[PDB]
Every structure is written in C-alpha cells, then in structure tokens.
Design a protein around this nucleic acid. Structure first.
Lengths: 63, 64, 62, 62
DNA sequence: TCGCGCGTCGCGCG
DNA sequence: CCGCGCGACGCGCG
C-alpha cells in the first residue's frame, strides 16, 4: 500500500505515548475492515515498531 | 450501582462535551459485561442524566 | 439434552393443534425463560417445532 | 445443503470409522478450506459429524 | 501446538 | 403488537 502502516502510527501518536487501543477501534475510525487492520498491526509488531498487550481483545500502543 | 454510575459519568465528562460512546466501548474500558453496562446506562437515562442517540450500536452522551 | 427432551415431551402430551408459550413452559418446568427460548429456537431450526407469530410467540410440534 | 452432501458422501466412501481433514477435503472437492470448516463444524452442531482432537483435527461420521 | 469454524447483536426487559 | 433466542471471539493465516 501507501500506506495503512503510516495511518495507524499516527492515530497512536496523536493518542499519546503510553495509551493503547483495540483493532476494532482503529477499524471503524480508519474506515478499514478489521481484517486488514490486524495484519498490519501484527506486521508492525514484527518490526518492533508496535507493542502488543495480550488479552481479549489485545491492546496496541507505541510505548 | 452508584460506584458504576459515577465511573460512567466521569468517563463521558472527560470525553469532552457533545461527544458520545457505545456500551461495547464502555465495557472494555471498565472491564464489565456489556449486559451490566446497559442496566446502568438506561437507568441514568431514567434519571435524566444521559441521552440515548440512535445508531448502530446506539450512542450515549451526557444529558443537556 | 435433558432440556430438549423435557420440552418435546410436554408439547407431545399437548394436543396436535395445541400451542403454548415460552412463559408458560418457564413457569411449568422451573427453567429460565432464556433457556427455554434458546431450545425452542434451536428446535425450530431442526424442523422439530413450529412457531406462530404474535406476542408472545406460540409454539407447537411439526 | 449440497456442500453438506458432497462431504457426507466422501466420508461414507472413505469407510466406516474412517476420518480425514479439512485440507484434504478442500483439495479433492475444489472448495476453499474456509467453506469446508464452516460446514464441518456446522454438521458437528447437528450431531451428524464427530470431531477428533488433533492438529489438524480429524473428522468422522458420527 | 497454522489449531481458525468467526457470523452479529439493536436487547434497555423488571 | 415486552417481541428477546444474545454466548464469545483471542484470528494476524498468505
């Protein structure tokens, strides 16, 4: 893309370091299906750019 | 309960003025079954403290 | 399950053109109406029961 | 359902007590794996099929 | 230990 | 024309 990766990093940056959010939350606000959201979230995780907090659902933040 | 009633009111107050949220949303940020959250949400509406807006799911905000 | 069996029986002991409500079944088998309704709608899927429109909805055997 | 029938047949031809996987069915029926599992688990709710523990899980006609 | 089926739900109801 | 069955869901999978 060009790029769902950058859009997410912003929503979290604007949210402020140390604050988390769910994929379901990012889905409805970025107008993007939760499916594509998670595959990018986990992609960012494999790049150490994001940190996941286990749970149901999982929480994502910049840290 | 009043404890839960006060927690919900706080959240909406901090959420700014004119903004709304959902029961599913409050459920996660309060660690409480949505079934229970709705009991309190609708009760506060009975007391004229909250207003319910149409939507999917419905949106809730402080009564004006 | 023990519920599906205990509902089918009751409705069978009922007439052919007879139909009852989930509320009547709840206050007859000492069972949460949520459970009764769960089973009823479950049996309606398997064609084992028939639902008649209205409030409350009426239920009978097929 | 037709998809339900194509699966039941395969398992019947496979023998009694025999089991296979979703991946296998997917390839021999030319149907996406997601669709296969939906029907498998669906039939499991109807008591038609039986799921055996494993990875991937094995499926047998109950 | 790639297991994955996964949809919708609005429900407040005593 | 209170009808209401409604649980859990974590899923990213190529």
């Amino acid at each position: 893309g060009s790029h769902m990766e950058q859009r997410i990093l912003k929503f979290l940056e604007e949210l402020g370091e140390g604050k988390a959010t769910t994929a379901h939350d990012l889905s409805g606000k970025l107008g993007t299906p939760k499916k594509e959201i998670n595959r990018v979230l986990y992609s960012l995780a494999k790049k150490g750019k994001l940190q996941k907090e286990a749970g149901t659902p999982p929480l994502w933040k910049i840290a």
